């Protein structure tokens, strides 16, 4: 999993469950 996504609103929005 790309934890960096949690730093990116666009990816964090989709991976809000992970982050």
UniProtKB/Swiss-Prot annotation:
Start and end residues of each stretch annotated as Lacks the Ser-Xaa-Pro motif that is crucial for potent interaction with nAChR: 7-9
Subcellular location: Secreted
Tissue: Expressed by the venom duct.
UniProt modified residues of type Cysteine amide: 19
Superkingdom in the source lineage: Eukaryota
Coiled-coil ranges (or none): none
Domain remark text: The cysteine framework is I (CC-C-C). Alpha4/7 pattern.
Record-stated family: Belongs to the conotoxin A superfamily.
Function, in words: Allosteric inhibitor of alpha-1B adrenergic receptors (ADRA1B). Binds to an allosteric modulatory site on transmembrane helix 6 and 7 at the base of extracellular loop 3 of ADRA1B. Also weakly inhibits alpha-1A (ADRA1A) and alpha-1D (ADRA1D) adrenergic receptors in a competitive manner. Potently inhibits contractions of vas deferens, spleen and aorta in response to noradrenaline. May also inhibits nicotinic acetylcholine receptors with a possible distinct nAChR binding mode from other alpha-conotoxins, due to a different three residue motif (lacks the Ser-Xaa-Pro motif).
Miscellaneous remark of the record: Negative results: has no effect on alpha-2 adrenergic receptors (ADRA2).
Protein name: Rho-conotoxin TIA
Organism of derivation: Conus tulipa (Fish-hunting cone snail)
Residues of the full protein shown: 39 to 57 of 58
């Amino acid at each position: 999993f790309n934890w960096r996504c949690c730093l990116i609103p666009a990816c964090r929005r989709n991976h809000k469950k992970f982050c």
